Structures are given as C-alpha cells and as structure tokens.
Amino acid sequence: MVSKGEELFTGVVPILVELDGDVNGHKFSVSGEGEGDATYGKLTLKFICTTGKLPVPWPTLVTTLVQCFARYPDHMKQHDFFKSAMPEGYVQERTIFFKDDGNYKTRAEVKFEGDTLVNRIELKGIDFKEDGNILGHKLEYNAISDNVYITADKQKNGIKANFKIRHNIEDGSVQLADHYQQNTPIGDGPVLLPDNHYLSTQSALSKDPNEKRDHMVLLEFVTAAGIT
C-alpha cells in the first residue's frame, strides 16, 4: 500500500509562496513561484520582493519561504507527517533566534489550492540591532545546508523540529540562527506521527541575470534520513 496524501506528490507539483513580513517595523512582502518533485526531493523556486528592497538578507528567509517535498525513502514512508496532512494541509510555526540579535516568529499555512501547493506566511521580527548582521546586510549571499531534526508532538497531533543554520558573515565569521518549529494539521483526518528522524536539506542561492527586482533563485534538495 501507498497512502492518500503521498499520492499528490508522485509528479511535479507547482508551488506558490506568499509572505508578509515586519522586522523591527520594516514591512515587506515576498512572492515566489516554482515546482517541487518529491520523488527526487527537488525544489526549484524564484522569489521576488514585491514591495521594493528586502530589508533583511535573503538567506535569512530561505527556511521560512514546503517540507512536504522531502524525499522519504521507501522504508521511511510511514514517518512522513507532511504529506499525510495533505490536501487539507498543516500550520507551520517557528521561532528563529539569531544569536546576539533579534528573532523571527513565523506562522504559515501549507495546503493545496487545486493542483498547486501553496505556502502562505506571516513573519514578525523584533529586537534586531539596526547595525547588526541582519538589518545591516552583512551576510553573504550563500547557500545553507543542515539537518532538520524531527520528533512527534502527540499533544498537537503533529511534529516539532529543531535545527541550526550557520549563515556566513562577510568578515568570515558566522551568524547562528537557532530554529524551533512546530507543525499541526489543519484537517481532522489521520496523520503520520513519526519516529525521530531528520531532513538533510541543501539550498543553493543564485540570481537571475535578467531580473532587476530584488529576488532570489533557489535550487533545493530535501531528503529524509536517520532510520536505517
């Protein structure tokens, strides 16, 4: 046997992302479009700041801007909460603590609208330093890679996750971003509550040479692991 949510992901699925943000009162919006192919754990996305200049570095928004596209190995498919919640979807919440700086709090709803997987997000950032690495734009436009450690959250019928992102600073140092995550289903049907495991995630950041708006191109791979 297969299992209902996971059938929505056997091919290439269009993705739409919409974010409204406010970081220390600097308001902005981002839209994104692209495709995901969970068979290969593969995401291709392009994001645009629709309000003008992005007031934070693009790399700091990657994790916020669809883990339902992870490739779960066959032997791990009973541990894929994300697809099991579809098409109704899930709420994904985070707190992202930037070491020696402010924090983002995010709330997103990830669900299908027809054949399109949509991620709608609100982001609120507070306590940032005006000349710190974030509001001062001191982070290199560089890839991020790390492991998302997932555990069951029986009490919300969902999952929690934790991970670290170590963003390179232009001086050669590192800006740590400690992520704490919770996901809860939107619908009332059965979902898969996983054993402990992780998502190995690699995001490559680039620019479209023909694009004059403030933007980010991503190529991302996401693979579940940690259960032999």
From Swiss-Prot:
Which gene carries the instructions for this protein? Answer: GFP
Q: What are the boundaries of the signal sequence? A: none
The species this protein was found in: Aequorea victoria (Water jellyfish)
Any idea which UniProt keywords this protein has? Answer: Chromophore, Luminescence, Photoprotein
> Which BP terms from GO are recorded?
bioluminescence; generation of precursor metabolites and energy
Q: What is the effect of changing residue 200 to F?
A: In H9; increases fluorescence at 395 nm excitation
Provide the protein name.
Green fluorescent protein
Q: Mutating residue 126 to V: what's the consequence?
A: In EBFP2.0; shifts the excitation and emission spectra to shorter wavelengths and increases quantum yields compared to BFP
One Pfam family name is GFP
